[model samples]
Target chain A: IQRPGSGQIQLWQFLLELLSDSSNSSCITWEGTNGEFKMTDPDEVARRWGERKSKPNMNYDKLSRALRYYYDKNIMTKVHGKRYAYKFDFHGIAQALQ
Target chain B: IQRPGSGQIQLWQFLLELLSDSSNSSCITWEGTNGEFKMTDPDEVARRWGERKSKPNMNYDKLSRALRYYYDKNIMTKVHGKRYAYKFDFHGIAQALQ
Candidate 1:
């Protein structure tokens, strides 16, 4: 769940809100079929991520660069040429689905 | 059945042979279920068709152009963006399979 801070809810905060809410029906939504999130308005989300990180030149490509870092950290990964831009480590959570 | 004339079995004749015999197989062959044919080596096939018609510069694209002529004549149609190139009229022929 995300709360309104002075700078509004952040990217990580928005992500957690979507993950926690059982009723998150937004332009950005979770797709469990591929264990990923499919966000339609990537440009807007990139802009938000930029604002959150104070990176003036933030774009989806640049945002994906940062997300690629999370791969080695074992948090998230990019599912290239997919409807979605990112996927979380479902290796642990896939068993929960079963 | 066409005999070997000054020209070898022509494109239309070769197409007929592939269509008629259930045994005669080659790079150019038919798919009955889809009422189509799959020719892997279009370049060679086109060259043969070119020689048969005395069109020395004939390529697959030009051969397909000729095939496009058969469309309104109710003989064949191009299945664009498919593995193979052309499809024959199967409206009457499909019932024969039953």
Candidate 2:
């Protein structure tokens, strides 16, 4: 079982991987332009995250708390008017990867 | 001037970008195996990080505090016996980017 420790994928990276895969679109998908995405089934996303981390009781509230921390770091931001909607700093990511 | 807000690269990403570029080797570079890196000149690394974030007063103290947060997320870890040394989970990164 996957666990949190050395050599474990981060939550943001996990979310990005899920977003990159079209097969997981039913749970979460791009919403608008510019790296925006919406969590259509946050429970499912949380479930998958839990499964990945071997945390059986992971919930949306806990998952979002972690996402909120990214806001200050400029890794992500929440959409003002939408529930479970967020955007990534794709430009920053592109620059960093370059 | 780069600032800490939307669309700015995260500190870890900046570090990775620097580590990826051999030109910056004099200041910071890979030390041992397994994604380990040492800040040969931590002041210089802080200077670059400050310049990237526009935090002129940034120092290793503040910078290391941010790095410490990654410890909990399993993104990075402090090398116990080395000064200004750290390691990244490249395996986790590979899987995430896959």
Candidate 3:
């Protein structure tokens, strides 16, 4: 679980929180952190990751692996493709996209 | 359906290769072009639009006319409202986001 100074949570954290509610609720609480993502506390994060892995005994190593498995799948269970975002791709812009 | 430029959806999309499954299948894959949607090919669209219009005799002019009805009614949808993100408002903080 994260503590107050556990470095930083992930933007994925906030998105997961935002997405966890969208259909039935999906009213985002924290907006600013949605882009970079943040977790309110370490315990909640550990709990969420714990639930994902269904590992009541989860730790960083296993939790991270579970996240990686979601790399290429459909939207709901998918990652928003960190592949072509954030960084400006001068070359790709002229190729796969242009 | 649209070109490599703009895309659209009415009922939504995706499943296995699920075109777009953002939620209980609320998926709409437009990360492609900020909604510059592609429906694999174009003819399929003309065919589908025919179905939506209940016109086995539909053509581009007929469909475009049907679609415009939504906009004129004001019952039509717009956008998420972006001014809050206008770059000028970010004169100072935009630098920090990076």
* Top candidate, metric TM-score: 2
Q: Residue B93 CA error for candidate 1 (Å)?
A: 9.7
* TM-score quality measure for candidate 1: 0.37
> For this target, which candidate reaches the highest lDDT against the unseen true structure?
2
TM-scores of chain B alone in all candidate structures, in the order given: 0.64, 0.82, 0.34
What lDDT does model 2 reach? 0.72
Off by more than 4 A, model 2: A1-7, A91-98, B1-96
Looking at model 1 chain B, which ten-residue stretch has the lowest summed lDDT? B89-98
TM-score of chain B of 2: 0.82
Give model 1 RMSD, 1 decimal.
21.6
Give the higher-TM-score candidate: 2 or 3: 2
lDDT of 3 by residue, B1-98 (tens): 11222224232111112233323122222223222233333244446555554557766455445434544432222233421110111111111122
Number of clashing residue pairs, candidate 1: 0
Q: For residues A1-97, could you state the per-residue lDDT of candidate 2 as single tens digits?
A: 1232323777766777777666787899877453678999999999988887888679999999999988776567898899789877532342334
lDDT of 1 by residue, B8-84 (tens): 54354455444444343354666543346667667766776777768778898887777677677555667778775
Per-model TM-score of chain A alone? 0.61, 0.83, 0.31
Q: For model 3 chain B, where is the 10-residue window of minimal lDDT?
A: B83-92
What's the CA error at residue B64 for candidate 3, in Å?
A: 6.4
lDDT for B92 in candidate 2 is 35
